Design a binder for these strands. Structure first.
Lengths: 112, 105
DNA sequence: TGGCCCCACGCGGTGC
DNA sequence: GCACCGCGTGGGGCCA
DNA sequence: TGGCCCCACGCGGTGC
DNA sequence: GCACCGCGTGGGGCCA
């Protein structure tokens, strides 16, 4: 399809997203820019065409669904492992036995 | 390669219980799976996960195994009902959201 | 306590 | 410059 | 702050 | 009736 976003940009949106719902909402603005001008064409639309409103382009809405169900959970785990587990593993490997300040306080007290 | 490094469900569950967070959980698995680096000789100091900063690289086989346990205890979010019950309401809300709140107007 | 552990964070290095 | 990556560091809570 | 943003929720309409 | 569906609404968190 033509309205494809880059893998890297999609990952960025996942990271910036506050929740899965907010993640979809961000993709909506990113993929439907014409509705989100200061003209607020967005107000004439919803996802289904309910309440006498126009229906959001189901092609792009199906793409948003794809990112939510196929990419979003994988990128959320990927970002947890890389940003939390890996830093913690490295910290544990390089952690000193005694702090630099605790060593110097002993170095001072022992000679004073 | 790992016959001994293979942890049972009971052993993994115990490590989860003493760990304070997912990150700390990964750190404990590191100690549990790399006992030779965490002796009083502190060979751990020559290593990190990638081999950056002139350090040696942790065995990527066991490091992948640590990942496996981390995602085995803290798995993927099953998005089954999420699209219909969370995303769709948010999409409609964003489409109808007013510029100013009415209480502020 | 005071020692061990966890994690947050300013930092310099890297690399384009 | 700036996005990214591990370091050294110390506040701080738990524990024995 | 105050503007932007997010999301929860009572509500009437719809449709079986 | 009743389960379901988008609406209009306002409490509240983030930020510069």
């Amino acid at each position: 399809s033509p309205y494809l976003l880059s893998d890297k940009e999609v990952r960025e949106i996942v990271q910036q997203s506050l929740s899965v719902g907010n993640f979809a909402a961000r993709l909506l603005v990113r993929l439907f820019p014409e509705l989100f001008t200061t003209e607020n064409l967005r107000l004439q639309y919803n996802h289904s065409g309910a309440c006498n409103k126009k229906q959001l382009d189901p092609t792009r809405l199906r793409l948003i669904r794809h990112y939510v169900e196929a990419v979003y959970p994988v990128e959320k785990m990927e970002e947890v492992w890389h940003y939390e587990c890996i830093p913690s593993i490295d910290e544990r490997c390089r952690r000193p036995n005694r702090k630099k300040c605790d060593i110097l306080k002993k170095a001072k007290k022992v000679e004073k």
